Structure 1
Amino acid sequence: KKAVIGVVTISDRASKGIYEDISGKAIIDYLKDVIITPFEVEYRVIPDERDLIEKTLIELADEKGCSLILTTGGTGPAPRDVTPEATEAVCEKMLPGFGELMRQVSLKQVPTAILSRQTAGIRGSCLIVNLPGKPQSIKVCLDAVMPAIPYCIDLIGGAYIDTDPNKVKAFR
């Protein structure tokens, strides 16, 4: 099975071109830097429209065959922040451990980490994980959860992915 990783930036302003997407860039740069195995990327930038988020996640998993989808944006307390809701809506099983750890890690930086509603779940053979917005926060987040990602994908029947032990160790 070929590894295809989805990167979805959820932001009205970003989708309107009001500002450049440094978040999606940070995610792709991180993946290219740590993943040893071969893989393709399916990048998407969309406004925070609930239906568009769900339709986009489903397209990447079902039609593009992504084994992993990383989202960035729309995970705070504000009413328009519906990325977690969209994620739950397309997944059959949620993984509470992801949200717990990502908040734990963020707490080391700022107390507002408890306002994050980022989560993760499974849709078929695809793992979907909600990431933060800031490039630095994205890096710290992935260093924390990436070690468990390749194995999780193995368990749901997704493509094989491995990372550079000197960068981040994919625990198996």
Structure 2
Amino acid sequence: AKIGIVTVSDRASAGIYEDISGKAIIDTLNDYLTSEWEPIYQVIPDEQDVIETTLIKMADEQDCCLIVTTGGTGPAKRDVTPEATEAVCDRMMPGFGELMRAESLKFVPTAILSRQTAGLRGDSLIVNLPGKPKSIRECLDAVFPAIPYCIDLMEGPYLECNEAVIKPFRP
């Protein structure tokens, strides 16, 4: 089981900020999973071609059953993570953005400003998350319960979870 983790951010990629977002993803997936898995981690600038390049590499060459991104989903000019995700996917999963936004609105009205989306590239699920750790955990909690079954639907690795933390639904 390989899961990709992409932090998208000029400042985090500069070695300016410490990367609290990519931290929260790895730590969350660690609380979630009891099966064996391998984190493939990268921090990259707000550059669309680079986002597209690094998603293709993880999915095509490294067999990530799942890639999660953080950053680059708001209305700022340089936020292009969703455009990059749309470009490298062959089909979109509109239910992910819908739910992540609906959950985040329990917290902040500005949840409607995220353009986060999800889609499939071959047998890889790609899911965009926002920058803030608290939002990361809340987005993953909303959406993760359905991810293992998605992977099984494309005959990928059988992800098993610590059920006291996250409960995967398999019909």
Normalising TM by the smaller chain, what interval?
over 0.9
Q: Hey, which bits of structure 1, 4+ residues long, moved more than 4 A?
A: none
Shift in Å, 1:68: 0.2
SS at match of 1:24: helix
Shift in Å, 1:57: 0.1
Which residue number in structure 1 is paired with residue 93 of structure 2? 95
Which residue number in structure 2 is paired with residue 105 of structure 1? 103
Shift in Å, 1:162: 1.8
SS at match of 1:37: coil
Per-residue CA deviations over 1:106-162 (Å, capped at 9, x if unaligned) read 100010110110000001110000011111111111110000000111112322212
- Equivalent-residue separation in structure 2 for 1:9 and 1:42 (angstroms): 11
Q: In the alignment, is residue 126 of structure 1 matched against residue 134 of structure 2?
A: no
Q: Out of 12, 16, 29, which is 1:14 matched to? A: 12
Q: Unpaired segments of 5 or more residues in structure 2? A: none
Q: In the alignment, is residue 74 of structure 1 matched against residue 72 of structure 2?
A: yes
SS at match of 2:64: coil
Shift in Å, 1:163: 1.3
Structural mapping, 1:29-44, within 5 Å: 29-44=27-42
**Normalised by the size of structure 1, how large is the TM-score?**
0.97
Letter in structure 2 aligned against 1:88: E
Shift in Å, 1:79: 1.7
- Equivalent-residue separation in structure 2 for 1:56 and 1:162 (angstroms): 27
Per-residue CA deviations over 1:5-62 (Å, capped at 9, x if unaligned) read 0000000000001110000000000011110111001000000100000000000000
Which residue number in structure 2 is paired with residue 164 of structure 1? 162
User: Aligned Cα RMSD in Å?
Assistant: 0.7
Per-residue CA deviations over 1:49-88 (Å, capped at 9, x if unaligned) read 0000000000000011100000000000112100000001
Q: Unpaired segments of 5 or more residues in structure 1? A: none
Equivalent pairs: percent with the same residue?
71
- How many residue pairs match? The answer is 170
